[PDB]
Amino acid sequence: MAEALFKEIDVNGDGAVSYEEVKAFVSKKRAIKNEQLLQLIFKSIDADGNGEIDQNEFAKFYGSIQGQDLSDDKIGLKVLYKLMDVDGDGKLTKEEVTSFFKKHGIEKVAEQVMKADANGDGYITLEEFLEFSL
């Protein structure tokens, strides 16, 4: 229902958008430097540089070429989790993880991991850690 929104914002009803309109749309979400970030995207979008765009451009603008941002961050953790496991299985336990974290003393993590389990076994995996992060 993207086009629905894109059109919605387009109170004008021309079927086309602009840089200010888009900025607003994105703004509706957050304001973490969307003006700049956008300006970058938009610019890259506006091939002709008419200063405006259309639904199509907006559709692709949304981000469907490499929808990534969080996962990328999940990779880091994942790796780490893999680093910890120097056995060669791809799974960790509350006791093991707690033993490794103990070094830090963030027992909390132990509590969070214990609560994360849910199942009630006393073990966890990488896929579970990721899915849980999502």
CSV table of N, CA and C in Angstrom, one decimal, residues 9-10 13 16 20-21 26 30 37-38 50 58 64 74 102 112 114 118 128 130:
chain,number,residue,atom,x,y,z
A,9,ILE,N,-0.1,11.5,0.4
A,9,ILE,CA,0.7,12.7,0.7
A,9,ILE,C,0.5,13.7,-0.5
A,10,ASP,N,0.4,13.2,-1.6
A,10,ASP,CA,0.2,14.0,-2.8
A,10,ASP,C,-1.2,14.5,-2.9
A,13,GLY,N,-2.6,15.6,-6.1
A,13,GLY,CA,-3.2,14.6,-6.9
A,13,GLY,C,-2.7,14.7,-8.4
A,16,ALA,N,2.7,12.7,-9.0
A,16,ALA,CA,4.2,12.9,-8.8
A,16,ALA,C,4.5,13.6,-7.5
A,20,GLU,N,10.6,18.0,-1.3
A,20,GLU,CA,10.1,18.5,0.0
A,20,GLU,C,9.0,17.5,0.5
A,21,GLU,N,8.2,17.1,-0.5
A,21,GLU,CA,7.1,16.1,-0.2
A,21,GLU,C,7.7,14.8,0.4
A,26,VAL,N,9.3,11.0,4.7
A,26,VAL,CA,10.3,10.3,5.5
A,26,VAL,C,10.3,10.9,7.0
A,30,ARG,N,10.9,9.6,11.2
A,30,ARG,CA,11.9,10.1,12.2
A,30,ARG,C,12.6,11.4,11.6
A,37,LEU,N,20.4,12.7,4.4
A,37,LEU,CA,20.4,11.4,3.9
A,37,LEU,C,19.5,11.3,2.6
A,38,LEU,N,18.3,11.8,2.8
A,38,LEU,CA,17.3,11.9,1.7
A,38,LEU,C,18.0,12.6,0.5
A,50,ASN,N,15.1,17.0,-12.1
A,50,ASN,CA,13.9,17.9,-12.2
A,50,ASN,C,13.5,18.4,-10.9
A,58,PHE,N,9.6,6.9,-6.5
A,58,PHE,CA,9.4,6.8,-5.1
A,58,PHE,C,9.3,5.3,-4.6
A,64,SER,N,14.5,-1.1,-2.2
A,64,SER,CA,14.2,-2.4,-2.5
A,64,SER,C,15.3,-3.0,-3.4
A,74,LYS,N,23.4,-6.9,13.0
A,74,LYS,CA,23.2,-8.3,13.5
A,74,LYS,C,24.4,-9.2,13.1
A,102,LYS,N,30.9,-13.9,32.2
A,102,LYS,CA,31.4,-13.8,33.6
A,102,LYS,C,32.6,-12.9,33.7
A,112,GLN,N,19.1,-12.3,31.1
A,112,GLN,CA,18.4,-12.0,29.8
A,112,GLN,C,18.4,-13.2,28.9
A,114,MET,N,18.7,-16.3,30.1
A,114,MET,CA,17.9,-17.3,30.7
A,114,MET,C,16.4,-17.1,30.4
A,118,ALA,N,13.1,-19.3,27.3
A,118,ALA,CA,11.7,-19.5,27.2
A,118,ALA,C,11.4,-21.0,27.2
A,128,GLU,N,18.8,-18.8,17.0
A,128,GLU,CA,17.8,-18.4,18.0
A,128,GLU,C,18.2,-17.0,18.5
A,130,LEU,N,19.7,-14.7,16.8
A,130,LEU,CA,19.4,-13.8,15.8
A,130,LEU,C,17.9,-13.5,15.7
